[PDB]
Structures are given as C-alpha cells and as structure tokens.
Amino acid sequence: AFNNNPSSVGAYSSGTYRNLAQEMGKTNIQQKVNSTFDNMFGYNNTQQLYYPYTENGVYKAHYIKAINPDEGDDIRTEGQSWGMTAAVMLNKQEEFDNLWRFAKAYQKNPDNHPDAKKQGVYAWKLKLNQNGFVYKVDEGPAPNGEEYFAFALLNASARWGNSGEFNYYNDAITMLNTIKNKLMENQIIRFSPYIDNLTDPSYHIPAFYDYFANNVTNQADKNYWRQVATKSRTLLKNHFTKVSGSPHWNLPTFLSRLDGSPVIGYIFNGQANPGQWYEFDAWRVIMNVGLDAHLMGAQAWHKSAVNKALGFLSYAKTNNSKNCYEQVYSYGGAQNRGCAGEGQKAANAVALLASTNAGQANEFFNEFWSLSQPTGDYRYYNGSLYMLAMLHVSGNFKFYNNTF
DSSP: OOOOSOOSSOHHHHOOOOOHHHHTTOSSHHHHHHHHHHHHTSSOSSSOOEEEEEETTEEEEEEEEEOOTTTOOEEEHHHHHHHHHHHHHTTOHHHHHHHHHHIIIIIBOOTTOSSGGGTTOBEEEEEEOTTSOEEEEEEEEOHHHHHHHHHHHHHHHHHHOSSSSOOHHHHHHHHHHHHHHHSEETTEEOSOTTOSSOBOGGGOOHHHHHHHHHHOSSHHHHHHHHHHHHHHHHHHHHHHHHHSSTTTTTOOOSOBOTTSOBOOSOOSTTOOSOTTEEOTTTHHHHHHHHHHHHHHOOOHHHHHHHHHHHHHHHHHHHTOTTSSOBSOEETTEEOSOOBOOHHHHHHHHHHGGGOOOHHHHHHHHHHHHTOOOOOSTTHHHHHHHHHHHHHHTTTOOOOOOOOO
C-alpha cells in the first residue's frame, strides 16, 4: 500500500530507497524499467531517443535527439544530461560514455571563448546541418543541463572508477566549477548568465547540491554546495508560499525572482512563454520536490507543495470538458494547450514521494503506470521524463558516493 507518511530521513542518509510501484501493488516492475531503457536506447525509431552521430562514415558519439516536428529536430543539453543520468542509474556504461563524449566534444563551448560568460558552459541547442554535420545553433547554456551533467558524472566516477576513457570525477569537478563560476547568482541557479534576479524553479534540485557537497574535497567547496542546497529549499518554499491560493492557485511557474515571486508576463527578448505560466518547465517542480523528499527527507513544505498542486490538477480535470488536466495553466486557468501527456503524468507520479494522500496517489500513480512508453513526434520531452520517472518510482534513482 502507499506509504502516506514519508520519512523525514532521506534515502541518501539511511540507504533505504522506496519502491513506489511496489507500494502501489504493481508487478514486473524491474522488467518494465529495463524495457523502458532498452526501447529508448535501442535502434527502433519508435520509442528511441538515443542516436549515433557519424562523420563521413566514422562513428563519433551518440546524442539524445530532441525530435521536433514544428521546427526541425535539434539536440539539447537537457536531454543529453538526462540520458546520461538514466544510463548511470542502470549501469549502462557504453551508453553513458557515448553521450558524454558527444557533449564534451560538441556541446562544450571553448574555455577561451571570447565571451567570458560562455567559457566552458554547454551550448543548449545543436543541430545537424544540411550535410549531416553538427553545429551550434545557440551557444547559451540551459543550466539544468550542466547540473545533471555534474550529477551524472559524479555517479559514474563512483560506480565505474576513472581509469578508462574518461576521468569522470575530474570532468564532474570541472562541471561544478563551471556551474559555480558561470551559472549562479548569490548561490541560486541562473536562468541566464545575462539576466540577474532570475531563476527557473524547475532547475532547483536541492538534493543534488547536497550530493555535490559530499563529493568535493575541499572544505570551502563542501560548505558552498551545502549552502546552495539550503538556499534552494528556501527558494522553493518561498515560491510555493507565493503560488498558494489566489492568484496562482497552487501551481509553480516557469520563471521566478530570487525571493520566489513568479515573474509576470514577458521580461526579455526571446522568452518562450509568460513567466507566470505553469508550463513544460514547471511540470518538473513537484517532481523535484518528490525527489528531494525521497532522497533527503520529507518536511512539511514538501508535502504541502505536492498535495496542494496535485489537488489543483484534480480539480482542474473536473472542470475540463475533456476530462483531463492540461499542459499549461496561468493564474489557475487552462490555456488550451492540450491534455496532459506522458511526461507531465510522469512528473506528477514522482511527486507522490512527498504526497500524504493515498487517494491522490492511486489516481496519479495509476494514470502514469497505465501508459505505454512514449512514441511519435512529441516523445523527446515526454519520453525523457517517462524514463526518469520509471527510475524514480522503482527505487532505481540512487546516489552513489565517491570514496576518498
């Protein structure tokens, strides 16, 4: 049965990882996790997101393909770093290494780039040109990518050691320093090097920062990352307080100021959507709160955040003519951007690790577990999230510490 009283002590400290799918009575759990990976990292052009990159017939590396019907397929640091994370959790080293080779070779901006703000960060959007060769479309970073790269590399070091192709550990420490020196403001993850007083709630994964602190060697840096972790929980608590009740109606938003206040409307040229929207980025916030609760312990704010957000989505579904909650809300109002797909459902399942309502857990868990693995043109974001969620709900998303 659903454990509606999640522990205040996290799996990272106790070593006890929940298996949510087992709590909800499911069977053949690990088989489903394994086939999810196999189909996403298999050459089937159906669920597949992992693709080889070759140059003049010579194999180079692999990437996670951000399939994009509206605008041409492209290749993103978010997906790449998520793919690596998935691979390390399932002990899939080749897959890991093939994705990391790509990132280091082709995503990384040179350390001597003329713009100091871009030095060593990872270009968020690549494409293959008309002749099949990779190029950078936008050199700016998507800092959630670097955060996952560092996390995945530290775990690869811990599981596999550093004497093969890659010194994963050194690559991880380099990545951490890049995050600290290029992608932080006042110990809060940046949305952009070029804009201050701006974060994206979905980029906040407080447990990762605690894991970083435990995996660096020097006292100053250990304290730096524990402070990041504390400030991140504070940001999230503040954002959840600001979105409670009117006018945001309990869903977190795309963009926030450093005090947690939702950003209202547009604030910069190029911005994809209004700041106050619960949209594709924001879906992941309560997923991250679930992660944090699982790994580092559930506190009152975790539970409130999740229960209130899931509560709003269930209400919203009762007030939808399609009998679904949708992908995009703004001030509690549906924006007619489609019924939730698999990724959003996956994020909400993971959130259950902070839920205290068994009824909600039944509903949201079974909606996720009933799905088939994503296919078709929208599978990059849905399928990437589906994979992560499969790991999280099966007790496979773990922190592997290095030993010193």
